[PDB]
Design an enzyme around this catalytic site. Structure first.
Site, short mmCIF file in Angstrom:
data_model
loop_
_atom_site.label_atom_id
_atom_site.label_comp_id
_atom_site.label_asym_id
_atom_site.label_seq_id
_atom_site.Cartn_x
_atom_site.Cartn_y
_atom_site.Cartn_z
N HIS A 40 18.29 47.46 88.18
CA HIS A 40 18.11 48.53 87.19
C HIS A 40 16.63 48.72 86.83
O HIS A 40 16.31 49.70 86.14
CB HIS A 40 19.00 48.40 85.94
CG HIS A 40 18.57 47.50 84.83
ND1 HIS A 40 18.98 46.20 84.67
CD2 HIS A 40 17.74 47.74 83.81
CE1 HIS A 40 18.41 45.68 83.60
NE2 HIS A 40 17.64 46.63 83.05
N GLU A 52 -0.05 36.00 84.19
CA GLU A 52 -0.27 36.71 82.96
C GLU A 52 0.13 35.92 81.72
O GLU A 52 1.13 35.16 81.74
CB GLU A 52 0.62 37.98 82.96
CG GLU A 52 0.18 39.23 83.72
CD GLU A 52 -1.06 39.84 83.11
OE1 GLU A 52 -1.73 39.22 82.29
OE2 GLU A 52 -1.30 41.01 83.44
N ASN A 54 -1.31 37.29 78.00
CA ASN A 54 -1.34 38.51 77.18
C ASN A 54 -1.35 39.66 78.19
O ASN A 54 -2.34 39.71 78.95
CB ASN A 54 -2.56 38.47 76.27
CG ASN A 54 -2.69 39.64 75.33
OD1 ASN A 54 -2.36 40.78 75.70
ND2 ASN A 54 -3.18 39.37 74.12
N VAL A 57 -4.69 41.97 77.89
CA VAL A 57 -6.03 41.35 77.94
C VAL A 57 -6.21 40.67 79.28
O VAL A 57 -5.29 39.94 79.69
CB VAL A 57 -6.15 40.31 76.79
CG1 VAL A 57 -7.41 39.45 76.95
CG2 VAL A 57 -6.07 40.89 75.38
N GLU A 62 -5.11 36.05 86.28
CA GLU A 62 -4.22 37.03 86.85
C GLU A 62 -4.51 37.44 88.29
O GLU A 62 -5.67 37.45 88.75
CB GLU A 62 -4.23 38.35 86.07
CG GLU A 62 -4.13 38.34 84.56
CD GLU A 62 -5.37 38.04 83.79
OE1 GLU A 62 -6.43 37.75 84.31
OE2 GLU A 62 -5.23 38.09 82.55
N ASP A 84 23.27 43.45 89.82
CA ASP A 84 21.97 43.90 89.25
C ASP A 84 20.84 42.91 89.72
O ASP A 84 20.38 42.09 88.97
CB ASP A 84 22.06 44.03 87.75
CG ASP A 84 20.85 44.76 87.15
OD1 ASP A 84 20.16 45.46 87.92
OD2 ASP A 84 20.69 44.67 85.91
N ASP A 171 18.03 35.96 71.27
CA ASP A 171 18.51 36.63 72.53
C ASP A 171 17.30 37.22 73.28
O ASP A 171 16.23 37.32 72.71
CB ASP A 171 19.42 37.77 72.08
CG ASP A 171 20.27 38.52 73.05
OD1 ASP A 171 20.92 39.54 72.70
OD2 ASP A 171 20.38 38.15 74.23
N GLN A 174 15.48 44.48 75.40
CA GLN A 174 14.89 45.49 76.32
C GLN A 174 13.38 45.14 76.43
O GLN A 174 12.76 44.73 75.44
CB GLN A 174 15.21 46.91 76.06
CG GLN A 174 15.31 47.50 74.69
CD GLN A 174 15.95 48.89 74.72
OE1 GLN A 174 16.04 49.55 75.77
NE2 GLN A 174 16.40 49.36 73.57
N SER A 177 14.24 42.67 80.78
CA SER A 177 15.02 43.03 81.95
C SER A 177 14.32 42.61 83.25
O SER A 177 13.09 42.87 83.36
CB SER A 177 15.31 44.53 81.94
OG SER A 177 16.05 44.89 80.77
N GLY A 178 14.99 41.93 84.10
CA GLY A 178 14.59 41.42 85.40
C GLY A 178 13.96 40.04 85.42
O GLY A 178 13.73 39.43 86.48
#
Ligand SMILES: CC(=N)N1CCC(Oc2ccc3[nH]c(C)[n+](Cc4ccc5ccc(C(=N)N)cc5c4)c3c2)CC1
Ligand SMILES: [Ca+2]
Ligand SMILES: [Ca+2]
Length: 223
Positions: A40, A52, A54, A57, A62, A84, A171, A174, A177-178
């Site tokens: 999704h 990563e 922040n 920043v 990274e 999914d 929990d 949004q 996700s993934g």
């Protein structure tokens, strides 16, 4: 993530941010060239951001790599969110270190009651909106299947599991996700869906990774 804690910079080395001009989904590094995420979260023009802390920043650890190929599971159903899961191949190999590491795939499924670590940059409010800049972590157990199916009647398939707290307050949400669900050092879930976030009797729903190991390994080897 609601009710979690600040993980600390690069404590979750396998965590990845999916960016298309902004952060939109999490993912997990499974090897130097592949990332697993939710079907999704599919988008054209994904850039993978590794090591990563922040997301707003540049702190120096990274690695930003573009995706060359995206493969959504052959039986993904956007209506039900059954299967999914999607794989993303990086244009070039990531350089693995203390802050950028892969997570192992499971050799078997996890038992209900097993404690897991969920992480992401998703909303931190139950009902309101507040997006963190730093990675948030949360310890949560896998719930029994009967509890999961009772919360979401007619909506749970054998490729899903629930994790969290029935009493609410903690929990994934949004923005998460993934993202990874790691139990006993293995990737057992992908942040998939839920009803609101941290609401009582509405735990998070995750893709059950242990059912896709052979598809993941066969797909990776032929691409
Ligand atoms: C009909 C059917 N089988 N289903 C109804 C639709 C579907 O649930 C969905 C489907 C699409 C969605 N699109 C969006 C924006 N949501 C809300 C959404 C999306 C991801 C979440 C991740 C974690 C959590 C969480 N509470 N931990 C909640 C989420 C809520 C969505 C939730 C899956 C199950
Ligand atoms: Ca920081
Ligand atoms: Ca950064």
């Amino acid at each position: 993530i609601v009710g979690g804690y600040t993980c600390g910079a690069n404590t979750v080395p396998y965590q990845v941010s999916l960016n298309s001009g902004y952060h939109f989904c999490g993912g997990s590094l499974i090897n130097s060239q592949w990332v697993v995420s939710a079907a999704h979260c599919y988008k054209s023009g994904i850039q993978v951001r590794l090591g990563e802390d922040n997301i707003n920043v540049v702190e120096g650890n990274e690695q930003f790599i573009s995706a060359s190929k995206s493969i959504v599971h052959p039986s993904y159903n956007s209506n039900t969110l059954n299967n999914d899961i999607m794989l993303i191949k990086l244009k070039s190999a990531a350089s693995l270190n203390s802050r950028v590491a892969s997570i192992s795939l499971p050799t078997s499924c996890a038992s209900a009651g097993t404690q897991c670590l969920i992480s992401g940059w998703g909303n931190t409010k139950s009902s309101g909106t507040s997006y963190p800049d730093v990675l948030k972590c949360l310890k949560a157990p896998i719930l029994s299947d009967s509890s999961c199916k009772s919360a979401y009647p007619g909506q749970i398939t054998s490729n899903m599991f629930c994790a969290g707290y029935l009493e609410g307050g903690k929990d994934s949400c949004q923005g998460d996700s993934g993202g990874p669900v790691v139990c006993s050092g293995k990737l057992q879930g992908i942040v998939s869906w839920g009803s609101g976030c941290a609401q009582k009797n509405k735990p998070g729903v995750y893709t059950k990774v242990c059912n896709y190991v052979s598809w993941i390994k066969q797909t990776i080897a032929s691409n």
